[PDB]
Each structure stands twice: as structure tokens, then as C-alpha cells.
Amino acid sequence: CDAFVGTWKLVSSENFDDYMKEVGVGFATRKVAGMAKPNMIISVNGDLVTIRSESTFKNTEISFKLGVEFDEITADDRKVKSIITLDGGALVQVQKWDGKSTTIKRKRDGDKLVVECVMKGVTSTRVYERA
Amino acid sequence: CDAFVGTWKLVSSENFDDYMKEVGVGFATRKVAGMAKPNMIISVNGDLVTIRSESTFKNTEISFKLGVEFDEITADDRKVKSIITLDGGALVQVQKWDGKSTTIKRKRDGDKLVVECVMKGVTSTRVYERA
């Protein structure tokens, strides 16, 4: 996870609302969540990887081991099962709940960290740079 | 857990610095941690309990099931194993790392939430009220 460790600030967001719609986030909530500009703080301690997200909407944190399924309460209050892997040099997260699934891919592109969240063929792209 | 769900704000802190010393928290961290006045936000989603701490020092979160050991990275960056129980109507947390242990007790006392953290017979006491 060496390529991912650091504090990342949001530089661009594309198609976030439509992704949230696909996920089932409420109309009012999508407004508030759309206004947030979360940072992403990624760190490692031993075999535990932590991804923190800090914003006006919600402060979240997941702590996990690569390849080991874990319980997560999402920023929009879904209770999901997540599994995160190192796959083609990306961190790939699959979240499953209520027979549904979404894939969140975190990948380096030049000096940026690109986050692509996919649900039913709808993709939100968020671009981050080091703080 | 119903008696614990809510947003709690710090109202008193007693012996916090000495507790941190006993834990082995370094001077500079103890200073910044002592200056912070963290909220504590406790929520439940199915069988998952989440305890979030928000302050200038750190934003942290643990999500866990009662009676099931889990991995935790503490605010002072210790990698510990935690187990949390409902015991005499209190939430009792035991954190273990490097052959050491500390116990964190969260209990209701009237309209307050009293948090007692014990390390080798040094006790820090922090009291919170609903926000």
C-alpha cells in the first residue's frame, strides 16, 4: 500500500450524484453529501490498513486487512460487507448489501490518486492530490 | 446499547495526563491530546456498534460487535486487540498490546456518561453530557 499512504485532498468529482442515486442515497442526503469535499487519509500499521475520510457530511474510517471480509457502515448508513484487495496495483474494494454490490477502485495515475466508484454501470470518478 | 446511543460532549476530565503517561504516550502527543475536547458519538446499526471520537487531536472510530475481539489502531497509534462487553449495564472495553492491558469503562450516571480508563491502577475519569 506504499503508493497509497498519505493525506489526499479532492481536486475533481464527476458523476457523483448519479452514482449516489444508483446506490439508493436519498434526494435530500445527496445534496448535503454532494457539497462535501472529503479528504482521504490512508495509513498502515502492521497488516492493518486504514482509510479515513473527513468532511462536512461525515467523518468515516475503515480499518481492514487485505483480502479479509469485514463489516462496514457506510457514510450513507448502509450496513455492508467489504473486501479489499491489491489487484493490478490498485486497491479494489467490493461492497455487498441486500443482494447488491458496488466496486470502489483506488489507483495511482501520475501524481494523483483516482477513485472510481461503480454501480450497475454508473461510475463516479474522484481525483485526489497529495495535501 | 440504547442508553449509550447519542452525541456526547466532554464536561470534565480528571487525571487524564497521568493515565496517558502510564500507557506510554509521548510528551508531545499528551499535550495535543490534553488540549482536545473530543465529542463521543455512539451509534448502532443491526449488531454493529460504532464509537466515534471527533476533536482537533484526532478523529477516530471503532465499529465492533459485542463480545468479539477486533483490531484497533488507537489515537496515540498503538496497534491493539480490543474486546467490548455489556457488563453490569456498562460497556467495558479491554485493550491488549505488547503484553500490556488497559480497561475502558463507559457507564451511565444520571444524565451523564462517565468514562473510566485504567492502566496499572492509574485511572483517568472523563464525563460527558448529551450535546
From Swiss-Prot, chains A, B:
CDD domains: FABP4 (cd19467). Changing residue 30 to A: Abolishes ligand-induced translocation to the nucleus. GO terms for cellular component: cytoplasm; nucleoplasm; nucleus. The modification Phosphoserine is found at residue 12. The keyword Transport applies. Keywords: Acetylation, Cytoplasm, Lipid-binding, Nucleus, Phosphoprotein, Transport. Its main location: cytoplasm. InterPro entries: Calycin (IPR012674), Fatty_acid-bd (IPR000463), ILBP (IPR031259), Lipocln_cytosolic_FA-bd_dom (IPR000566). Gene3D superfamilies: 2.40.128.20. Changing residue 66 to A: Abolishes export from nucleus. The modification Phosphotyrosine is found at residue 19. The modification N-acetylcysteine is found at residue 1. Changing residue 91 to A: Abolishes export from nucleus. A motif (Nuclear localization signal) lies at residues 21-31. Pfam families: Lipocalin (PF00061). Changing residue 31 to A: Abolishes ligand-induced translocation to the nucleus. It is found in: Cytoplasm; Nucleus. One of its GO terms (molecular function) is long-chain fatty acid transmembrane transporter activity. A fatty acid binds at residues 126-128. Lipid transport protein in adipocytes. Binds both long chain fatty acids and retinoic acid. Delivers long-chain fatty acids and retinoic acid to their cognate receptors in the nucleus. Forms a beta-barrel structure that accommodates the hydrophobic ligand in its interior. Monomer. Homodimer. Interacts with PPARG. Belongs to the calycin superfamily. Fatty-acid binding protein (FABP) family. This is Fatty acid-binding protein, adipocyte. It comes from Mus musculus (Mouse). The lineage of its organism: Eukaryota, Metazoa, Chordata, Craniata, Vertebrata.
